[PDB]
From Swiss-Prot, chain A:
Keywords: Cell membrane, Cell projection, Chloride, Chloride channel, Disulfide bond, Glycoprotein, Ion channel, Ion transport, Ligand-gated ion channel, Membrane, Metal-binding, Phosphoprotein, Postsynaptic cell membrane, Receptor, Signal, Synapse, Transmembrane, Transmembrane helix, Transport, Zinc. It is found in: Postsynaptic cell membrane; Perikaryon; Cell projection, Dendrite; Synapse. GO terms for molecular function: extracellularly glycine-gated chloride channel activity; glycine binding; glycine-gated chloride ion channel activity; metal ion binding; transmembrane signaling receptor activity. CDD domains: LGIC_ECD_GlyR_alpha, LGIC_TM_GlyR_alpha. This is Glycine receptor subunit alpha-3. Zn(2+) binds at E184, D186, H207. Strychnine binds at Y194, N195, T196, G197, K198, F199. Glycine receptors are ligand-gated chloride channels. Channel opening is triggered by extracellular glycine. Channel characteristics depend on the subunit composition; heteropentameric channels display faster channel closure. Plays an important role in the down-regulation of neuronal excitability. Contributes to the generation of inhibitory postsynaptic currents. Contributes to increased pain perception in response to increased prostaglandin E2 levels. Plays a role in cellular responses to ethanol. It comes from Homo sapiens. The N-terminal domain carries structural determinants essential for agonist and antagonist binding. The channel pore is formed by pentameric assembly of the second transmembrane domain from all five subunits. The cytoplasmic loop is an important determinant of channel inactivation kinetics. It is a multi-pass membrane protein. The alpha subunit binds strychnine.
Curated annotation (Swiss-Prot), chain C:
Residues 1-215, 264-274 are extracellular. It comes from Homo sapiens (Human). This is Glycine receptor subunit alpha-3. The record marks L254 as: Important for obstruction of the ion pore in the closed conformation. The chain crosses the membrane at residues 216-237, 243-263, 275-295, 316-336. The alpha subunit binds strychnine. InterPro entries: GABAA/Glycine_rcpt, Glycine_rcpt_A, Glycine_rcpt_A3, Neur_chan_lig-bd, Neur_chan_lig-bd_sf, Neur_channel, Neuro-gated_channel_TM_sf, Neuro_actylchol_rec. It catalyses: chloride(in) = chloride(out). Belongs to the ligand-gated ion channel (TC 1.A.9) family. Glycine receptor (TC 1.A.9.3) subfamily. GLRA3 sub-subfamily. The gene is GLRA3.
Swiss-Prot record, chain E:
Forms heteropentamers with glycin receptor alpha subunits. Heteropentamers with GLRA1 can be composed of two GLRA1 and three GLRB subunits, or three GLRA1 and two GLRB subunits, or four GLRA1 subunits and one GLRB subunit. Forms heteropentamers with GLRA2. Functional GLRB-GLRA2 heteropentamers contain four GLRA2 subunits and one GLRB subunit, although alternative subunit composition cannot be excluded. Forms a heteropentamer with GLRA3. Interacts with GPHN. It is linked to Hyperekplexia 2: A neurologic disorder characterized by muscular rigidity of central nervous system origin, particularly in the neonatal period, and by an exaggerated startle response to unexpected acoustic or tactile stimuli. Channel opening is triggered by extracellular glycine. Heteropentameric channels composed of GLRB and GLRA1 are activated by lower glycine levels than homopentameric GLRA1. This is Glycine receptor subunit beta. Keywords: Cell membrane, Cell projection, Chloride, Chloride channel, Cytoplasm, Disease variant, Disulfide bond, Glycoprotein, Ion channel, Ion transport, Ligand-gated ion channel, Membrane, Phosphoprotein, Postsynaptic cell membrane, Receptor, Signal, Synapse, Transmembrane, Transmembrane helix, Transport. Glycans are attached at N4, N192. It comes from the Eukaryota. Subunit of heteromeric glycine-gated chloride channels. Plays an important role in the down-regulation of neuronal excitability. Contributes to the generation of inhibitory postsynaptic currents. It is found in: Postsynaptic cell membrane; Synapse; Cell projection, Dendrite; Cell membrane. InterPro entries: Glycine_rcpt_B, GlyR_beta__ECD, GlyR_beta_TM, Neur_chan_lig-bd, Neur_chan_lig-bd_sf, Neur_channel, Neuro-gated_channel_TM_sf, Neuro_actylchol_rec. Disulfide bonds join C133-C147, C193-C205.
Amino acid sequence: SPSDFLDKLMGRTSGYDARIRPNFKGPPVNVTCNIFINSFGSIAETTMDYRVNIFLRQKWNDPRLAYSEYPDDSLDLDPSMLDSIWKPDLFFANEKGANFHEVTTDNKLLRIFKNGNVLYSIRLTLTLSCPMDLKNFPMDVQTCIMQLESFGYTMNDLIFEWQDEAPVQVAEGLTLPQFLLKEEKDLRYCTKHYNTGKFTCIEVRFHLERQMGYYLIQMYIPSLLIVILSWVSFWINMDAAPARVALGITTVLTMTTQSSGSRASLPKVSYVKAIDIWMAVCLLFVFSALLEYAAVNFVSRQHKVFIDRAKKIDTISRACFPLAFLIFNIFYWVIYKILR
Amino acid sequence: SPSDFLDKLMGRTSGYDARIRPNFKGPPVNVTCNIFINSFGSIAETTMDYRVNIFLRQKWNDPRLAYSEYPDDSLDLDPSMLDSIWKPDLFFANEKGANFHEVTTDNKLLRIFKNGNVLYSIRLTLTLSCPMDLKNFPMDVQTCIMQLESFGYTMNDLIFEWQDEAPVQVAEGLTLPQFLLKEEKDLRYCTKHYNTGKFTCIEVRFHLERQMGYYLIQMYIPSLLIVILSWVSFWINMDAAPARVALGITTVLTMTTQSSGSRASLPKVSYVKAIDIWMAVCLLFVFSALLEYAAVNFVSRQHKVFIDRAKKIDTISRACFPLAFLIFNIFYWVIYKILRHED
Amino acid sequence: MSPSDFLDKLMGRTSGYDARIRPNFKGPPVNVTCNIFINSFGSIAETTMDYRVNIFLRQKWNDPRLAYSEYPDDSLDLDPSMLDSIWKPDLFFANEKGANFHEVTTDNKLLRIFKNGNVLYSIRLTLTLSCPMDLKNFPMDVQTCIMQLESFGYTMNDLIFEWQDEAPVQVAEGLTLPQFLLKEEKDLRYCTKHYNTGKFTCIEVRFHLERQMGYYLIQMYIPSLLIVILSWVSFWINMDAAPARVALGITTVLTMTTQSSGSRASLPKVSYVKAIDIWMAVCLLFVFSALLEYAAVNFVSRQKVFIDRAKKIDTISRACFPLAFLIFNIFYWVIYKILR
Amino acid sequence: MSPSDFLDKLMGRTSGYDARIRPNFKGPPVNVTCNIFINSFGSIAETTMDYRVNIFLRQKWNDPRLAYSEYPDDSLDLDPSMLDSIWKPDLFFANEKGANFHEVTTDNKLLRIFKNGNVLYSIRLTLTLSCPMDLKNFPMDVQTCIMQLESFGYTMNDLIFEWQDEAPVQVAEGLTLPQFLLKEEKDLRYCTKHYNTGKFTCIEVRFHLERQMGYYLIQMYIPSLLIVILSWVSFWINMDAAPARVALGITTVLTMTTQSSGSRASLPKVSYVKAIDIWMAVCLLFVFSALLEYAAVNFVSRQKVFIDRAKKIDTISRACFPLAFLIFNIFYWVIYKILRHEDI
Amino acid sequence: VPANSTSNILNRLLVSYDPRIRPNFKGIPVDVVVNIFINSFGSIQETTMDYRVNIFLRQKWNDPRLKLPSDFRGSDALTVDPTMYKCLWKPDLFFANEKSANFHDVTQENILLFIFRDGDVLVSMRLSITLSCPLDLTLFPMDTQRCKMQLESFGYTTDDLRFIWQSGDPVQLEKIALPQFDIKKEDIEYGNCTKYYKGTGYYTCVEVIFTLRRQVGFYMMGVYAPTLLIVVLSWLSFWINPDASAARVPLGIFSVLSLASECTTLAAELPKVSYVKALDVWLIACLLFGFASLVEYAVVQVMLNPTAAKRIDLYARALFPFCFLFFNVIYWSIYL
Ligand SMILES: *[C@@H]1O[C@H](CO)[C@@H](O)[C@H](O)[C@H]1NC(C)=O
Ligand SMILES: *[C@@H]1O[C@H](CO)[C@@H](O)[C@H](O)[C@H]1NC(C)=O
Ligand SMILES: *[C@@H]1O[C@H](CO)[C@@H](O)[C@H](O)[C@H]1NC(C)=O
Ligand SMILES: *[C@@H]1O[C@H](CO)[C@@H](O)[C@H](O)[C@H]1NC(C)=O
Ligand SMILES: *[C@@H]1O[C@H](CO)[C@@H](O)[C@H](O)[C@H]1NC(C)=O
């Protein structure tokens, strides 16, 4: 009878207790864990965190769960049976909040093989934490870290290892709202050392590169259009003061609005970001155009060859400013696209 | 005695244990499940998720719950009895987070028939997730998904099937806050494959299309008003330079701040949306009007015989700009209403 | 002797040890030595006056009922679930809005029993502490937030807390704050709170936090300097050329009043006046004073012998405003960097 | 002799004590004397009409079933976990939007059983109470937020609540509010709510709160004074500078409208008018009247023999408006500071 | 007889009382009498279309298995400790239009249990439910919302459980005050719905329908004084001499931009709906009036390039107030 078999295996009549690890006071019991990412996203720069949804899996061997009644090896058990067997401690080192998932039942899997190997996969939702470097914001590449670590036992009893083949796999059809996922994911050892003792640890790296497709349209194109519009004043004659003062204040006001929005869209940071550099340079160029207007107006109104000097300086400015803008633009783009 | 009947069926003296599925290591037990949408809404673009309130129902047959004491077949039991019988595992795959409803009791139903069939309906509240495309944001059509999938058992032990008739039914009088719900609901099979095994799965599709009335009133009318305000400056005489420059400045400022406000309330996406195109064209037209005023001022101040040129260019611009706006309007509306979508 | 039998005899059903009575029942008070481990730190918000930590609280105490002799080894590790059967000292944080344990894939607790009876008990926690702040000089303020560990159930006659002798508070290497900086010294005081019901022990730790100027400088102060320089530019221009000066006044006023609006919004409402408020008010006053000076110059010029007066007052203003602004800046910076 | 044996004989399995029957059953109602201890305060949000507290609620009562004689001492301290085995009085806060216990490393509870049967039971709590507010004079308002204690399971025939004779409500030393001030006096009274199911005991404590105007003064009154002072500049400007006066009036009206709209966006919707609303409306009315007066003077001027009339009306306005504004200022401030509002 | 012996022998595992079987099993359906005491009301978030109440739900029925001893003449009221509430049969009851509801528990559980002489059992619980009602915003500033609350049964069909309201004054409330709404204590009309679910059967449900009418005291000021002042300011441009040609245009442009800003700002509070609200109608009409003033100035300027211009200006200045008064009269007549 299957109920009698279950009772004899792990029930009260079995004599098996879950308060003792396998091969107590001997070699450390090793666990080979691999995950399966089901979802991703919600990467927020303000809080420096992201949410995953993983089917964490673990495997270990104990000699106390060996059976011979059933010839079949891969035996499936109910999720509710997991409360009566030993389970290795495992907590994520860097996480702000995590919780199980239970709808219409608990989300757990249990499977016992003939030789004693046990498979235990549990669904989880995590909110991990990864500090980010925003030195070059619109063209940054992030590496967010997920760490697995034992808590109850030292390295003398519990050891974690990745699976040799396909340790981390991504669900098909997954896409990120604003980032990209690299096809390679680094795996390393951490082995954190605390005051109490030596605890095992396990780390997996995710490489994310931001796509500037939105930032182009939102900021760079309007800035280019505004700074190009600012140059129309040079071709306008100096006597048309209302026209030039019209093509004045407007571009600096628009640049101020763009700078305010771009700077207010991001979290606080000590250093200066690339978008800040671009916005500052464009604002300075608009200010320089207005200052050139003021200088031409001041020289022209020097109450006899003065008009010729004003024409010469206006022509020089109209011929020089595009070259300066082009050289700044090419230098900025090449450095932040190659040498960054 | 009914208490003795319950004890003999699934009680202490029954011998029944809820730890073994029906037909152990035999044919896989099939489950026919259907839902009943009781609420809908909160479809938010900034998070790409929506909330439902379903009366999930499951039906299956196990031979160990067959009784003969009661002549009647349809027997109703307490919700608290559900923990003494076997139940199939079922989790929603694309779920950000869901919780039961426990008010004054557990919201559960149980019904055991004579032949052994079991009905088990439980009230839930799901925050599902559906990725969206925003190629044409104000006039888009979205398809959000709900997936049912087994976790504990492979396809060799548990199989899910939709009901033959009326698989998904909606409560009468349901209204969406902004969207509209179609009368067609596709039913497919997913049957997800993992390395552990081949798990059964079940899918359902909801079709939603967006109503543009709110977006129309909130954004398209003010943009038209602002561009007409910009055009008003054409007929003002060029001698009154301050009057025209004030309009040229204020219309540009209003247009750019309105564009920023309109675009600040949407998720950041790589592609370009329809509202972005409309805002860009309106801003470009305002800028072109200001540039035309600058040009007509420049022409007039060249110095007799030039005032005629300024008047002719001003009249040509005033007679030409509205036609360009109208042709752009008809082109954009037809291309985004006929061929691009709803085709 | 099977380990299960040993655990049953030590603190199990047949042991006779009950967790309902503290060691040395109404004898000498039991002393507890506690030390912590800050795993993560941050989320300092002035709008709510709170901050979040993530500590590995550890406690040590001695009881004679948990002394064993069967196992020769001294450091014996037990399961986290075994902690519900031993006496645990009460410990609640006095100043905290909300705290919760971490329970992912198991309970996050540790237990270890030595031969002489010493017990180690480390439990992971996440806390949202509370510390009121002083914003007299907001951009250059120094904050001291307080974490208190206090007993609740027992009086001073039964439970006594005290910090560990050597290295009581340790911080994980590589920890960084999003906006603040951590001092290398941390005070360790005593509270010893007195209540109506009795005399309760308490333990206090001080963290020194100092805000950085890296962000605020670039975001606020430098643009104000550039705005005031732009305002000064107009004075050096000839008076007859009205439109250039009018444009330089309008753009200056508009940009400064656009920038000054958002500075005060993010901070909470307080009675006192902050440094950023003073700086913004003074800069706005200088810009308005420049505009009023230009208006007065135009008014005087709109009344031979008068143009000389207009030009001399214009050059007097142009030579006087830089001196006033520089003396204001030196006074402000010196007072708020030395005396305050 | 052993403490475990004593505990089991007092309230254990062999004790015969059942926690489902109140002391002296079918007799006089058991009296419970309670006092609180405020540990934190603040988070007074007007948009939601609530405030958060943090109290060490304490309850004292006597039952003859917990009298001991083995231990000579009178005061005895027990584990917090023992509180699930003895009778406890029901107590809920009627005006509560939500409250939760505090558990960290253990439950936050205290138990103390005296020789004669008196029991002390102090439990830590965090409450989000609700108090309606009147905003007739918003920047100079005085608010009274209420905390109520009430029995639920038993009527006044079984349970009676009373305040403590001395030190009923205690405040932690150095407690500060972010914006308000806490008065020394705290009123205590009875409520004794009556329902159709019976007559329930109740207990009420009042806190007196008065707002500080230091922030609101700087934020609102100073810019309004600057705006109204700059409005008077138009009158002294010559009529020939009509566009300048038009622009100054328009920008002053714009500033007043923006400030008035911003002021009301930070408060909950209310049918009646507030003091700040009256101030903003009157300042906007003064600016609008100044602009209208300028328009009327300009209309008069553009109809010799009339320029003198325009000058005299402009001077009359320039001499009368500051006086009227100062009279309104003193009248409004004295009426909203001394008698018509505040001052108890 | 021991004091606890009454509760021990009346209902416990020792006695033959099974809480898993409804009273009158396979017989007459159980009748439940329900009345509600409203404790708090408010937090009507128009953006989420939900409101939060706080009620003292009460329900009584007849349970023949719970009869007090005949010799026990200890009055009808037999207040039982709330802990023993889990040892007797309870009727299922869930709120159909509920989004999030939870119990309250501070220092104890908030539940009161009564057992009368003949067997009637009274249960009163303190709940904090968050109901939902679909708002109708056809005339937003002066609407009359109709938000309801429908109780229901889940476990048992109409053959076993049936809900009936209290005979006299079922819904009670003491001086409930709301920030923006006024709830009539008399218009609490209620009926019963007995919803039918296909595939399972009938299920009883009783509903209470309130009547909330928004009071226009805040919207009136905040969105009709500034707009009226802006319109009058725009009218003020007519009396300015046309020769200025530079001061009248700023008045019109300021009027239209201020009205546009007001219209944009005032739409953030309300939820997104397809139809057109009365407030939007008023804002659109005011914006159109301002734009008409500006375009009439443009027409005057065109005609000036002055007797005809003066005649046009006088005609417009005479015409506009009458047309605006007519519009205001008809608008306030439609939306009285
Ligand atoms: C588990 O892996 C460790 C790794 O060092 C090894 O020493 C140990 O023997 C393995 N297995 C067991 C059952 O201890
Ligand atoms: C359930 O459906 C499956 C579908 O293949 C069928 O094989 C099976 O026999 C059915 N019934 C049972 C009781 O297993
Ligand atoms: C714990 O330390 C205190 C410090 O005063 C001491 O009195 C006491 O004896 C120590 N230990 C025990 C087991 O009581
Ligand atoms: C408790 O106080 C009440 C107050 O009236 C009194 O009647 C009663 O006797 C007191 N004591 C007991 C044990 O009931
Ligand atoms: C509920 O309405 C149904 C309508 O079929 C009716 O049969 C039933 O008696 C009603 N109950 C009450 C209490 O009004």
